[PDB]
């Protein structure tokens, strides 16, 4: 196929310049099983995509929920014994925990030993995230600005 894995995940239709953030973000390289990464491959509709192939590994919930916020386009394929047993595109969650960082500098979340949490109101415009602690709602662009 365009590579081939017996069991594993193939995340595909990843926007150009996101694939590599995902290797850092989901810590995918702390692994020993084969990884095929194709940076800046074609994808007819939106020209240049990335593709990542983690053989014999499937993502935990949090990761696919994060994937929904970093790559809504992407598709996750569960391959068992070369059978594309499942292919799903990530829907947004209700809440994101322990990975985002509140834009409000005066949030108690910074100072204190707490896992962050955000509410995910899908606005027609974009994604508005609400901090659990300070109750400020923010644009996902603001929050995810790296």
């Amino acid at each position: 196929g365009v590579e081939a894995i017996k069991r594993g995940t193939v995340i595909d239709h990843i926007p150009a310049q996101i694939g590599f953030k995902l290797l850092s973000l989901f810590k995918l390289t702390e692994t020993d099983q084969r990884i095929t990464i194709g940076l800046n491959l074609p994808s007819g509709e939106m020209g240049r995509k990335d593709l990542i192939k983690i053989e014999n590994t499937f993502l935990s919930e949090d990761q696919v929920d994060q994937l929904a916020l970093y790559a809504p386009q992407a598709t996750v394929n569960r391959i068992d014994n070369y059978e594309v047993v499942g292919k799903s595109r990530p829907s947004l969650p209700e809440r994101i925990d322990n990975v985002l960082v509140c834009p409000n500098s005066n949030c108690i979340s910074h100072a204190e030993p707490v896992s962050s949490s955000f509410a995910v109101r899908k606005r027609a415009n974009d994604i508005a995230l609400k901090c659990k602690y300070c109750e400020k709602e923010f644009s996902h662009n603001v929050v995810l600005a790296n």
């Binding site: 005066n106 108690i108 979340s109 707490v114 609400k130 901090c131 602690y133 109750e135 709602e137």
Partner: protein, 310 residues
């Protein structure tokens, strides 16, 4: 079991029209009939990590009038969090092994909700968290609006001042949006303007609000005029163009006001309400202040008593 028994009172969002109305019902009651041992034998912690004259002294007086004991601090300077670098999380964990409810004021937003994750089963009542919520204020404002106007539906309410950093007007617009027909007029410097997160909610419920450049352009139409203080201590230095009050109410400005109109203020005030207003029948900010005793006794009673019969 009453509905607010053992609840944390943190954000007005978490409360319903029914929750609010139960405290005002209770408030008017304790105002007509004192209960001086209702909380006999409970010790309560008044933890103020930020300055107060009204919320702390009203709270401690309400506690005393019901028979409770108070333990606390006026400033963390003296706590082991202030001198020995302990966390807030740890401060709340041991204080909760000592007392029956924690009343706290804190400079960072979210402190209160943080505390409830460590209070065990002990109720945390929020006295103000930086610029976020101030629910107990709003309870005594709703009580005063009701005494003066007899309705909390279809009013014309103007909020004037620093609406950005004002935890007071944040909680009040959320609570008043739980009643039908209230019309909002917002007069603030645009840099100390009302958060769009409150606005979106007023638009999610189809409530009408408008912004105005002057008090005089809505004076004639308001039931309540709610003045606020520029939160100097909260201003980012970009906003120092805003420290001195832009809209200052003077006695003469009330000339074309509804005879039923009231000027409310959370207090402290600085230059924004000229002392000559004080002598008019429209000034009602010290009455409002006195009303914090009834609203704070009601809330303590409901949180700490499974059923009240009064």
């Amino acid at each position: 079991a009453n509905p607010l028994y053992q609840k944390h009172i943190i954000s007005i969002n978490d409360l319903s029209r029914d929750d609010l109305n139960l405290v005002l019902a209770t408030a008017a009651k304790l105002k007509a009939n004192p209960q001086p041992e209702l909380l006999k034998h409970k010790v309560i912690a008044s933890c103020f990590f930020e300055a107060s004259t009204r919320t702390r002294l009203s709270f401690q007086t309400s506690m005393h009038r019901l028979g409770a004991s108070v333990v606390g601090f006026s400033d963390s300077a003296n706590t082991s969090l202030g001198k020995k670098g302990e966390t807030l999380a740890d401060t709340i964990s041991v204080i909760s092994t000592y007392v029956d409810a924690i009343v706290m004021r804190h400079p960072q937003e979210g402190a209160a909700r943080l505390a409830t994750e460590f209070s065990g089963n002990v109720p945390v009542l929020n006295a103000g968290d930086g610029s976020n919520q101030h629910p107990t204020q709003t309870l005594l404002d709703l009580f005063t609006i009701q005494q003066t106007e007899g309705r909390l539906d279809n009013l014309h309410v103007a909020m004037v001042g620093d609406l950005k950093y004002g935890r007071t007007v944040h909680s009040l617009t959320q609570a008043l949006a739980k009643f039908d027909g209230n019309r909002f007029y917002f007069i603030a410097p645009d840099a100390l303007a009302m958060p769009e997160y409150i606005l979106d909610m007023l638009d999610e419920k189809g409530i009408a609000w408008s912004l105005h450049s002057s008090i005089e352009e809505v004076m004639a139409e308001v039931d309540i005029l709610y003045m606020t203080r520029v939160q100097k201590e909260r201003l980012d230095p970009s906003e120092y163009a805003n420290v001195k009050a832009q809209f200052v109410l003077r006695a003469s400005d009330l000339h074309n006001a509804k005879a039923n109109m009231k000027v409310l203020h959370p207090l402290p005030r600085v230059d924004e309400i000229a002392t000559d207003v004080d002598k008019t029948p429209h000034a009602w900010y010290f009455q409002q202040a006195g009303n914090g005793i009834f609203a704070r006794q009601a809330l303590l009673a409901l949180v700490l008593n499974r059923d009240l019969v009064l």
